[PDB]
Amino acid sequence: MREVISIHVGQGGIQVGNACWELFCLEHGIQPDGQMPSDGDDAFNTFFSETGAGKHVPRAVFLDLEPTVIDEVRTGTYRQLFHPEQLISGKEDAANNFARGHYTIGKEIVDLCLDRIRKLADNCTGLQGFLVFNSVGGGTGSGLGSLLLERLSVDYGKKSKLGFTIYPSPQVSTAVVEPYNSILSTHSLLEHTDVAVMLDNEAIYDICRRNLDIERPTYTNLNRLIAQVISSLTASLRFDGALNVDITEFQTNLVPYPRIHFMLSSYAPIISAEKAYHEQLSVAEITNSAFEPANMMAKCDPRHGKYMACSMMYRGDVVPKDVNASIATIKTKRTIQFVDWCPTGFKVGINYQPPTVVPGGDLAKVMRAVCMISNSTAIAEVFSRLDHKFDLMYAKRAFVHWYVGEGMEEGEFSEAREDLAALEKDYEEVGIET
């Protein structure tokens, strides 16, 4: 009865959609052809829809302008799973240009995208909200994501939207003009995304290096871990638990002010197959490891700031009194400090289903897990660094012609700069104690 809609745009969006969908298919035991051997509760309704006889079709849509990834998916190992004409592919790359995908080429695909969204939402009956995946530091991703958010925020309105975006690392970065796109996309998403989640790359690189002891990781490990996080987040809607929390119990329990909805995640335990069975895997130790700054999902030091709200979701056979005692110790230790106007800051969710493991993966089969989502004032530094880079490379009108020649006016940079400065001022102001 309850469903969500998955939006996947950009190469990052598609390469994370592949991982999240293989994980979801494996968790419900759906074969790649879509059939259910089974051998029956309706726990697949959240992500899949029955075709009337046999197979199940995911409730997701894929957008991108360069056909390469889409064709590779259509010829991959899940060729007969997805709906063939909901994998919308464009003609020409936006090629790392914000204006291209938002003013010139992106306007001829939004009509098809909205038509497909309408067709799928009409099939849906108890829609909970939207989960969007996009890469900010790229032309087509940023532009099409901004345009889609603009269109949905007017067409559908109050239905919640959560965006799992991938900002640049402080130094581990690929593109050179990418800060421009990042600033403009943040400007676009600030007043349109209900929740935003940080998914930078080098932090997860450090995570996999330190825990799995994998010296040769690629994008696949990153995407698998991110998919694990998403599944742990969305388990409660489809699995039985002691304290179920739905998607509407995120912004009502985690967003102090409408402007402040940027958040950063963490997941535990992260361990290999050899080091796990010689370890204790206690609830207290995993919840202590969840708060380690080096275990955090994004390159920020939360010790440089305060905490506003945290939502933690356990899966496995955890016990509520154990959770309460662990949280008491968390509040007891002084290294982490909360804000005065938040006496109670913890949301607790519990799910009975233990985490599922993928064959050929890196993580071991574990019987307890915790996924934590935190809103904190320590998000200021990443935006400060992005602004610093933007100012340094904008002092002399670098690469401005590439943007102005596509139709976008010059003055848009100033507006984004001033709005980001206002956001930084707001995060500063909320940090003063009464």
Partner: protein, 77 residues
């Protein structure tokens, strides 16, 4: 550069030991014509690139689905 010079046309053997004799030797061994075929033609591919290990891998964007655990098939109880 006073190459060629005191090393004229010769096939097989260890040569004369002046100039780049070592480097021409392995070229002459792997392929006929150690140096500059007379205008038996010379293919630039072997001269430039090197030893050819013919292999074409997979994209590994298509390795997402396929992963096998032989253990699961045990009868258990």
């Amino acid at each position: 550069t006073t190459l060629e010079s005191y090393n004229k046309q010769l096939q097989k053997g260890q040569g004369t030991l002046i100039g780049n004799w070592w480097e021409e030797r392995e070229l002459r061994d792997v392929t006929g014509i150690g140096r500059s075929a007379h205008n038996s033609v010379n293919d630039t591919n072997e001269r430039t690139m090197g030893k050819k290990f013919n292999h074409i891998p997979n994209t590994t964007n298509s390795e997402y689905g396929k992963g096998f655990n032989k253990a699961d098939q045990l009868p258990r109880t």
